[PDB]
């Protein structure tokens, strides 16, 4: 596929997780090919697999083809059949129910400054055990919910939570030789203020308790590591996922010998 990632996944033994959080550093990554490319950072909360995969998604995305501009914007997504025939962005199809219009779905976000002022998108997703509905909060304020009625596998809880970045490479390099940026456009090793991060890496267990998994409990995914990568930075209060990169310049020059 033409998608590349720098993501971490927390796999639970069953579908009993009752929520998750993500506090995502906001940036305005540049796209090499804005006709079709996109760059985003999000959470994915899921249950099932294959055609029974159900997802709850929220984060920021730079996708001019969909939003009409190059700003990072708040988005949501979902699927009830592994992206085969169900699911959509934002409120473009029936699915998500917005209850509070204080925050707009699709709103532009203020991007952080390299070596300067940082901005974060705090999102908290919580399952209501009376209904199975999954509620979304932004910076502590309610937005709405994904109702249990659209799902079949995630109605009682989730088995997997993933966090991180993704780019879509419309130029057909497989995401291996495009300067479309992920996160801030800088490699994770640059750290706070320079590389993008995801913090508040927390889940809610079956009993309703908040758990912050240790670094070793996540599986990492970075299939184009010379272009986009991730690095955990453990602070003394909470674990950071630094992720992203500048992408790879197309400087291969192989010929037979």
């Amino acid at each position: 596929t033409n998608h590349q990632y720098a993501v971490i996944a927390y796999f639970y033994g069953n579908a009993s997780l009752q929520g998750a959080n993500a506090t995502i550093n906001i940036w305005e990554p540049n796209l090499k090919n804005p006709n079709g490319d996109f760059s985003l950072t999000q959470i994915w909360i899921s249950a099932g697999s294959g055609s029974s995969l159900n997802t709850i998604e929220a984060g920021w995305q730079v996708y001019p083809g969909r939003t009409g501009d190059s700003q990072p914007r708040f988005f949501i997504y979902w699927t009830a059949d592994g992206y085969t025939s169900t699911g959509c962005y934002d409120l473009t199809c029936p699915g998500f129910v917005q209850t509070n219009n204080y925050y707009a779905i699709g709103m532009a976000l203020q991007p952080s400054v390299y070596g300067g002022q940082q901005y974060e998108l705090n999102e908290s997703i919580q399952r209501d055990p009376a209904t199975g509905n999954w509620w979304l909060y932004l910076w502590g304020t309610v937005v709405g919910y994904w109702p249990a009625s659209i799902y079949n596998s995630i109605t009682n809880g989730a088995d997997t939570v993933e966090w991180g970045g993704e780019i879509y490479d419309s130029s057909g390099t497989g995401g291996f030789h495009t300067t479309t940026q992920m996160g801030s456009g800088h490699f994770p090793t640059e750290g706070y203020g320079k590389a993008s991060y995801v913090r508040d890496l927390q889940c809610v267990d079956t009993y309703g308790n908040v758990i912050s998994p240790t670094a070793n409990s996540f599986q990492g995914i970075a299939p184009a590591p010379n272009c986009y990568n991730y690095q955990f930075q453990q602070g003394s209060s909470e674990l950071y996922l630094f992720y992203g990169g500048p992408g790879c310049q197309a400087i291969a020059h192989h010929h037979h010998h």
Binding site: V7, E162, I221
Partner: peptide
């Protein structure tokens, strides 16, 4: 999982 969901996104990878």
């Amino acid at each position: 999982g969901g996104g990878g």
